[PDB]
């Protein structure tokens, strides 16, 4: 039921980590336990695949709506 | 554009094509989430290429990623989808979620977030101790 609510969750939590991602010494950081010590080429790589999930996370939302 | 920001977008795009193509598949791209600690589904690996593209021809040139970094990520009505994300949650119809409501639906709904992050989200939100938080200000917050 209600096929909006994990869109919804989706969509918001995606825009957030998006965000918390341009701060480098936000907790969103500490998430990738399997990368001990993240060096410089790893934010570049998170910080893009965290784009591409932002926008699947808006066409799901929309999709549902 | 700067050329400072196509510059480094340069750089990026070069972390995910490996074999010089100038294209990024949707395997490439899951070697590199792969490479964090991650498992993805071969279609969530198709999903994220099918966003980025413009082409159809299944891969990412340099110009669609281009085109995805430069994206407007908080004026191209980002708002207002974000905005009826959260009127899911507000049934009361109050512009008003609780804190509380926000983590469990942060930690146990959709990606999940690491607890951590919600206390960082709830404390740099409309969280003034009114545990209630008024997401007209956390839009905001991220565009
Ligand atoms: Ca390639
Ligand atoms: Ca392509």
């Known amino acids: 039921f ?19 991602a341009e701060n480098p010494d936000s ?18 790589t998170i910080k893009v695949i ?10 799901k939302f929309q999709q549902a709506r | 554009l700067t050329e400072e920001q196509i510059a480094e977008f340069k750089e990026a795009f070069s972390l995910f094509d490996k074999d010089g193509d100038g294209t990024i598949t949707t395997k490439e791209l899951g070697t590199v989430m792969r490479s964090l600690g991650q498992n993805p589904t071969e279609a969530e690996l198709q999903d ?10 299944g ?5 669609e990623f281009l085109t995805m970094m430069a994206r ?6 980002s708002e207002e989808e974000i905005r009826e994300a959260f009127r899911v949650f507000d049934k009361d119809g109050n512009g008003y979620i ?6 469990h639906v942060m930690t146990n709904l959709g990606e999940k977030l690491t607890d951590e992050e919600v206390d960082e989200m ?15 200000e956390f839009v905001q917050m991220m565009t």
């Open chain 2, 98 to 103: 609780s804190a509380a409501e926000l983590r």
């Open chain 2, 48 to 57: 994220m290429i099918n966003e980025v593209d413009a082409d159809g021809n």
């Open chain 2, 122 to 136: 709830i404390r740099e939100a409309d969280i003034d101790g009114d545990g209630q938080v008024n997401y007209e």
């Open chain 2, 72 to 77: 407007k990520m908080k004026d191209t009505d």
């Open chain 1, 27 to 44: 907790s969103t950081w500490k998430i990738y336990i399997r990368i001990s010590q993240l060096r410089e080429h790893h934010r570049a």
């Open chain 2, 59 to 63: 891969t990412i040139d340099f110009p």
């Open chain 1, 2 to 20: 209600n096929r909006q609510i994990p869109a919804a969750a989706s969509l918001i939590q995606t825009a957030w980590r998006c965000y918390a």
């Open chain 1, 50 to 59: 965290r784009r591409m999930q932002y926008f699947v996370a808006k066409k």
